[PDB]
Amino acid sequence: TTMIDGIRTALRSIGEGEISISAYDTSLVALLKRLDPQFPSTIDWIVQNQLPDGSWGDASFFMMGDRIMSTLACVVALKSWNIHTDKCERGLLFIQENMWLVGFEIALPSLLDMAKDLDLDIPYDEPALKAIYAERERKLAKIPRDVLHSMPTTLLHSLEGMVDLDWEKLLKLRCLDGSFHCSPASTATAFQQTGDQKCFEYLDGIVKKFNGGVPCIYPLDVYERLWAVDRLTRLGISRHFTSEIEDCLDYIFRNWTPDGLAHTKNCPVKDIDDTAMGFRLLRLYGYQVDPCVLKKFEKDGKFFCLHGESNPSSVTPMYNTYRASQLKFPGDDGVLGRAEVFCRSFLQDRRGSNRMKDAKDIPGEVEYAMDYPWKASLPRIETRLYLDQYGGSGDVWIGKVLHRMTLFCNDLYLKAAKADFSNFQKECRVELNGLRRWYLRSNLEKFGGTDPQTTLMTSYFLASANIFEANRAAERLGWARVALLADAVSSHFRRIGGPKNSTSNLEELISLVPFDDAYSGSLREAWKQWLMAWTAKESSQESIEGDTAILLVRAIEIFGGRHVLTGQRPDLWEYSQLEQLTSSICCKLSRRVLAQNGESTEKVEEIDQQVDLEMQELTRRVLQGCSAINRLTRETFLHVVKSFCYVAYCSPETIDSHIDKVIFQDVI
Amino acid sequence: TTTTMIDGIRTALRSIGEGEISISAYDTSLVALLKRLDGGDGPQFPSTIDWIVQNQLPDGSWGDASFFMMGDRIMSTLACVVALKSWNIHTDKCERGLLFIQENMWRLAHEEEDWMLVGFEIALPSLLDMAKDLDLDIPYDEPALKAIYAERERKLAKIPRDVLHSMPTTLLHSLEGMVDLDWEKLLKLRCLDGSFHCSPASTATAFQQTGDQKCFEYLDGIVKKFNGGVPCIYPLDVYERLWAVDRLTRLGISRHFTSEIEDCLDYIFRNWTPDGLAHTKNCPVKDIDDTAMGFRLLRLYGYQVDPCVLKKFEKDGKFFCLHGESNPSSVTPMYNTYRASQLKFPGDDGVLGRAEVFCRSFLQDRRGSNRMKDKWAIAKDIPGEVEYAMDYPWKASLPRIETRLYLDQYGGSGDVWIGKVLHRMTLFCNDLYLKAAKADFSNFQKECRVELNGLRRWYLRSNLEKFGGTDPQTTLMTSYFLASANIFEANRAAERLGWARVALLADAVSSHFRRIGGPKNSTSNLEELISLVPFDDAYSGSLREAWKQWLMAWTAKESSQESIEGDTAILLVRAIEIFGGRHVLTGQRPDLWEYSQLEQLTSSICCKLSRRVLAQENGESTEKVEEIDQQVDLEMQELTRRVLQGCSAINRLTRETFLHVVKSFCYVAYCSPETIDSHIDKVIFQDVI
């Protein structure tokens, strides 16, 4: 409990960003001379963050580009100000011996050229040096200088290595805070070249905000929120921070642009990674968002990361787009349709290859996203897996320096999640152990599977994988119980021929569900209808699965005790229409599992193609958080259907390997 | 006036009772033969003879003046003689018409094989014996009789001492002539009013031979309430009610008497037995004609009834009219069960299913035939009644069509009934019923044309013909006609036109929507299109939402396989309910579910319906279509259940609205366009009177 409050106070205090200080950008800001050093606290930061091998940068992850480039950039500060020559050469040793990332081949050449303007014994004569110094010109050539001055671009992030540019038409391109694409390095060098006080103002605040020392990117108010939400959400503890999450999710909605989302509010250049993350979470949490904001990253069928700079697209952004395409609504622009296909192909061509590199388990995160589309993504399934995939402090981010995200790439995030999940597994085992008794002492295993522990186990598991909450135990057990009766009864009819020869008064049977003073009567009425559905759908070809599901949501709605006001006309329609979809969607599923007869891949792929279709209009009506039906009622429909889909799209082998991994393979 | 005629039928319906039936000369003169109880020499009921004298027909016959039947005139005519002569009074008129028997007796040989009177072959030979005794000049040696005489004896072979005297049979109706019977075991058999199978005649013979004063009360009861004179069967409290309802219902004017009908329909529910129904409350032998009528009308009017009472009349594969006795089945009783078999619910005992199958076949063997005469009724247009129910099953039976047709089929005062004598039922087979129904129907047609011109104007004024059907002129006509054939009432104009308008708009938009391929290529908004349908401001809020919801359904069901015909049906019923401004006030959980299910079934039925009408002209296969026809028919039963079960908490009017919309979709899919406008012509344009 203390931990939840820990994450809460961290989220309530959300802001510009929790980022690690970058050694390179801090010393490059140290290089700015008094307006009459200008930030002696940049230097005061520098002296202390020296690693024992005499080097700099990220300590916990050793990277060549990072330890070298961060180390020397601190050196070019200490010696060019002729102070602390003790550590200055002590780290000059590190550079010499280990001489054998973003903007690396642009900021490093201007940093050696800057190393020449001082004296510093460093192997410039490196065979590795010529290969990346050649790419200096291999890129400064494909960049059109007259285009770098016309529209804000990703290049403006590396102006320390840029030579002889028109600042008259460049200051027109900065971010809203005055920064040059949010690099303090690019703004320091832009200030050495022009004294724009709004371009200074970005810099001083960044050092004031950190009491010395400055990161490699700022601010990142959007990226951080979006990703902190997705992370808490996947970890299953999102329910604890509902006001805080909906607090900053609002912020993302406020700053939605028709051109997409950037990593910060005040960056005019947008990227697909942030837009897809934003689009998914905004739609997932019930906001009105239009996916057409994506066609800004489509150029002739292909999907890049920036609007124009057709760079090679990385792996993580395509994952995040693929996920956003999974919340496809039928009324949406086709761009989301095209996006799904492209991103699936991108990640499939790469799945069978270790070319999944960009974080702890990025292939596992991706296998899931591809093997379990939305219709079959049960939140506890994803969450159990995600505990074994979330990197914690292990995740590192590739910027100008190696940097880390304090707020959402946290170790407290895991300790909290694995706690809340263990208590779920504990509450789950006691839950079913109580269920097993209930099943047996009812002469109820005589009906059902030829191994009723298996028909019980999956029937309880589905309900708990979806309605997993602490207190919602009333509903969960109700779902499991009613499910078992329905399975039992369907089994009895299947090997007897129908209610035609129902010798018994099997209406009763609900009295196997314990009497609640508010629950029992209405549950009798719903169960009566499921029976009445059998005798009518009996001597025909329509399946009953549609009505089995419809009964379920009816009970789950009786437990948990919310009713649908029926005087209001649109309240009636939205409910009555949700039932139609669930009745229709589960009936089509039961037709696919019959064609798996077992022949015609062409025919099965037709049924799948249209179930996905009807699922979209359901997913729309369930998430559309303005609809006149209670969000919990809407979730109840989504829960039942997803579980039905889950079952219909999964081998019994895969299904209980999940059961073992979520309920029994204890975390912590 | 129209109001008076409705009041005429009404005040008569309030005064319903034991029967309004016509007097029988035969049953009456047989009661004059009963000598005074107080040991006096005047006949016990002198008012029977008072009646005799007054109604001798001009040819000296007796019986039905308006309908001449030989069998009818002989038995009623001589029975009056064997009365008048047996008291040796009025021998002057006794003779005039004694010759009628003399001259026309030979003609007994011509009668229509099919409709011979009841107990004719038992009660007429019994009447030679009473004439022989009074010694009358009669052709007892008529060769025409030998055929009925000796086929009495073989008729009178199914008499056993053991069965006639242990459990009641219909022979008890005609024991006027019967020898060597043991009344001690026979009185244990009669009906509750004391009659012998409700025959005043048979009860008189049972009185000459048994002084049973608790059975006399029955005869005195008839003679007081009919002021002398006596019907050929009494009482008819169940039959008369059942038939008055079916007639007023098919004549389309049931609604004016909703209270009156629901009164005596209650009278039937109270007296429903697991053995079936008879024509009276107090007759232990039940018959399929009354039992079938009661079941249908009861289930039609929202009563809980179980068809399993029908297997009381199933005798291994066949459907007779009585429980014990297996007899040649007549036409009207099979028609009336067949009509009842149309209301099968999916929960029913199977016998109602099988009966449908039998009488369909029974009536088919007979449709292509001279045989269509009934043994029970002689009605103006009896095959037309059978035509419709045979061609138009429940799902496609629109109430205004049936009623239009029935107006030219109801015989009115012309219908005559076959008992021991020809008798008539004045109450529900009269001319005021027809005069009234045609009135209520003409005022329906007049208002129909007036509305039509409003539709024609409205369709124009909205420019919606730009993309109607091919000829929007008939897509208008039919879409009004479907709505008017169903919601036809006086007041309901609000809903009807709204139905027609919303149907036209919806179809119009769907037409254009197909033209271009979906909203993907739609430059237009269309959301505000309903403002083309007139509407009060204290209503526009919900009609917009229903339409917006329908469009959302379009965008979903596009580039998919499911049709929208379901959702257009939902849209209509949703719209009609808005125009009638009733919503489901606030119900418990099963109220919501029950509504949600009607929407489900309606949408599901109409998709399945529009799945055959494209697989019609496409990949034929009679068996592939019977798969769809089966699948639609099933859903209809569960829906027909959910509409008609009058215990439900959803308003009657909401449920009926679902049936109207679905029935109209059915009518269209199952009707040749050639026939469909013949109906349109006949109900809206081919005016009655």
Author numbering:
A (entry chain B): 81 to 116, 121 to 184, 195 to 452, 457 to 694, 696 to 767
B (entry chain A): 79 to 767
Sentences from the study reporting this entry:
To determine the structure of OsCyc1, we used the stable N-terminal truncation variant of OsCyc1, OsCyc169–767, from which the plastid targeting peptide was removed. Next, we determined the crystal structure of OsCyc169–767 by molecular replacement method at 3.5 Å resolution, which contains six protomers (Chains A/B/C/D/E/F) in the asymmetric unit. The overall structure of monomer OsCyc1 is similar to that of AtCPS, AgAS and SmMDS, with RMSD values for Cα of 1.86 Å, 2.15 Å and 1.94 Å, respectively. As the crystal structure of OsCyc1 was solved at a higher resolution than its cryo-EM structures, particularly in the γ domain region, we focused on utilizing the crystal structure to analyze oligomer interactions. Residues located within or near α22 interact with residues in α25, such as Q627 with R720, which are at a hydrogen bonding distance in the crystal structure. The interactions between α23 and α24 include R652 with Q675, as well as E640 with K686, possibly through van der Waals interactions. In addition, we found that H-bonds form between S674 and E677 within the α24 helix. When we analyzed the binding interactions in the crystal structure, we found that the interactions between different dimers are similar. The interaction between dimer C/D and dimer E/F is identical to the interaction between dimer A/B and dimer C/D, suggesting that a pseudo-twofold symmetry axis exists between the chains C and D. In addition to the abovementioned interactions in the center of the hexamer, a linkage exists in the γ domain of protomer B and protomer E, which protrude to the edge of the crystal hexamer structure. In the crystal structure of OsCyc1, the distance between the d1-oxygen in D367 and the d2-nitrogen in the conserved N414 is 2.97 Å.
The large superfamily of labdane-related diterpenoids is defined by the cyclization of linear geranylgeranyl pyrophosphate (GGPP), catalyzed by copalyl diphosphate synthases (CPSs) to form the basic decalin core, the copalyl diphosphates (CPPs). Here, we used X-ray crystallography and cryo-EM methods to describe different oligomeric structures of a syn-copalyl diphosphate synthase from Oryza sativa (OsCyc1), and provided a cryo-EM structure of OsCyc1D367A mutant in complex with the substrate GGPP. The structure of monomer OsCyc1 consists of an αβγ domain and a catalytic center located between the β and γ domains. OsCyc1 catalyzes GGPP to form syn-CPP, in which new bonds form between C6 and C11, as well as between C10 and C15.
